[PDB]
Design a protein around this ligand. Structure first.
Ligand SMILES: *CCC(=O)N(C(=O)[C@@H]1CCOc2ccc(Cl)cc21)c1cncc2ccccc12
Ligand SMILES: *CCC(=O)N(C(=O)[C@@H]1CCOc2ccc(Cl)cc21)c1cncc2ccccc12
Ligand SMILES: [Ca+2]
Ligand SMILES: [Cl-]
Ligand SMILES: [Cl-]
Ligand SMILES: [Cl-]
Ligand SMILES: [Cl-]
Ligand SMILES: [Cl-]
Lengths: 301, 305
């Protein structure tokens, strides 16, 4: 019993964290096989960041301009190339601690663990969700750039995020491991703002099912709703629309607890209407949206 | 910016997790040097748990009755002894991945990371606090016994907890790595209940400082309180007393934000007698007490391991 926000064991990722230096800029890199991946803005000065021409800045660099440090061992850079917003530094040594891995691009609502690093040294691990506005509500200071988000579903590390920047509201923006940003963001100091952040409805429903599995039933009601009526209400609370795909995703949890998805949708409608009235659901006074249907089945069952 | 419940990197501990089997019972073990540590109830059947005589159960077991498995390699048990509620299995191979470590017993209110394992395989890491009633609000299923709690001090892993059991309310009980339980619990299938819990006051204050560092300042007020007046109010709301030691420990955060500890206590006093009034602090509608003053400083300054 118990329901906690849990991150994946970070060991497989810690063995990949290296320090990358280019001139005066120092950030984190992901050393997999003989390649170190890091944000391409490592080649920029603060006076280049407004309108950087990365192709132009990179062509002026040689391998000896990149200092890669794995622990106390300096790695020799034998090549450098750019793929979208990620710099790929070819090194002379394959990482012996390279886990079984793949690069995955995730969708909003998906969750992942973040190993926050500074100077190639892991400092902490936390669990995150990709917000519907493509930002992550992380905990990142200056120097955390290059820290990665991942999932470890059996033996294989799926790298899904690389941290690049913090937006003026304190939220974070980054790319998949192929350097493509999540969201309408660019790696430049130009005025950028996240879209209105909404609640991940499917995740709140999943967490309400996790509450029923752990014994909590106070919020249940004898109502059902249509998918359309639910969405009209949920949208008024800044909740993401629930699609038929989301309803199908909640099927296993619906079958396990004996509560139809649209019946649980009516409980959610009521919770948004009344608040919790001094009660908690799984030790929380707010509706949690950073547990996917998959995380609920993995943690509870 | 950002404030998350963050656990220490679990890598140094993952390299120590092994599977321990005794008959039909299978749980997790901590392999450090040539010793595997695990709950002593691994020797018990479901009937033995009713009233176990662990010396009697242990004297009947030989080394080959314990199957230790490190990944896909079976470790040969060359000795077995018991220290309090922990079984120590001597093995023929020293763990090459043994980190720099020490065994520490923590005090209630102190926090640590838990590497939840099943069949010697780590499945997740989470942060938690030793509640003042000596339970941990963990996330543990059957087969999680032997999962450990730890902190990291630079390169040293301080093992502070080993999971043993779940109480009827869903909360968890375990021991330090010397087998001494945290709290008035025993390793036996019998009626046991946690005492009424309290809020870790110094940790709530630390989290209020973390909110201030992050730009959440609505709860700040012009007022201050005496340490004695604050405690009279805290006692009323099942909040742990704030000692002068706690006030000193919050000093660096008090200096960084420019808010005196007793100035922040008047905010906390108001939060108890008035609530949050529909507002949140760091995205939370409740006062968080599972971040110590050290966790706040560590997270907000970027300390690495
Ligand atoms: C690695 C630090 C860093 O670069 N951060 C930034 O957000 C940069 C600051 C200037 O603006 C900027 C524009 C584009 C890009 Cl891609 C990067 C930056 C950074 C990242 N995470 C958290 C941070 C907290 C505080 C300062 C800087 C942060
Ligand atoms: C590792 C499984 C286990 O033994 N757990 C227990 O709590 C035991 C169940 C029977 O009663 C009992 C009495 C005393 C002791 Cl020391 C242990 C037990 C176990 C541990 N954590 C979470 C669990 C969840 C569900 C079932 C069993 C759990
Ligand atoms: Ca191992
Ligand atoms: Cl681009
Ligand atoms: Cl609206
Ligand atoms: Cl909450
Ligand atoms: Cl919410
Ligand atoms: Cl108490």
């Amino acid at each position: 019993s118990g329901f906690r926000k849990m991150a994946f064991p970070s060991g497989k990722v810690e063995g990949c964290m290296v320090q990358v230096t280019c001139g005066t800029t120092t950030l984190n890199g992901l050393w997999l096989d003989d390649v170190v991946y890091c944000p391409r803005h490592v080649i920029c000065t603060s006076e280049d960041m407004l309108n950087p021409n990365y192709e132009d800045l990179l062509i002026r660099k040689s391998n000896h301009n990149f200092l890669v440090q794995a622990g106390n061992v300096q790695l020799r850079v034998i090549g450098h190339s750019m793929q979208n917003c990620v710099l790929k530094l070819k090194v002379d040594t394959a990482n012996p601690k390279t886990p079984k891995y793949k690069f995955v691009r995730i969708q909003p609502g998906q969750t992942f663990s973040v190993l926050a690093c500074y100077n190639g040294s892991p400092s902490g691990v936390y669990q995150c969700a990709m917000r519907p506005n493509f930002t992550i509500k992380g905990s990142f200071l200056n120097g955390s750039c290059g820290s990665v988000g991942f999932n470890i579903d059996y033996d294989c590390v799926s790298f899904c995020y690389m941290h690049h920047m913090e937006l003026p509201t304190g939220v974070h923006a980054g790319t998949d491991l192929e350097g493509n940003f999540y969201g309408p963001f660019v790696d430049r100091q130009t005025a950028q703002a996240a879209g209105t952040d909404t609640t991940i409805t499917v995740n709140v429903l999943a967490w309400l099912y996790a509450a029923v599995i752990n014994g909590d039933r106070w919020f249940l009601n004898r109502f059902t709703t249509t998918l359309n009526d639910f969405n009209l209400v949920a949208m008024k609370y800044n909740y993401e629309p629930l699609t038929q795909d989301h309803v199908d995703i909640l099927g296993p949890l619906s079958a396990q607890t004996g509560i139809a998805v649209l019946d649980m949708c009516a409980s959610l409608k009521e919770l948004l209407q009344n608040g919790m009235n001094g009660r908690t659901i799984l030790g929380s006074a707010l509706l949690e949206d950073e547990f996917t249907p998959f995380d609920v089945v993995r943690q509870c069952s």
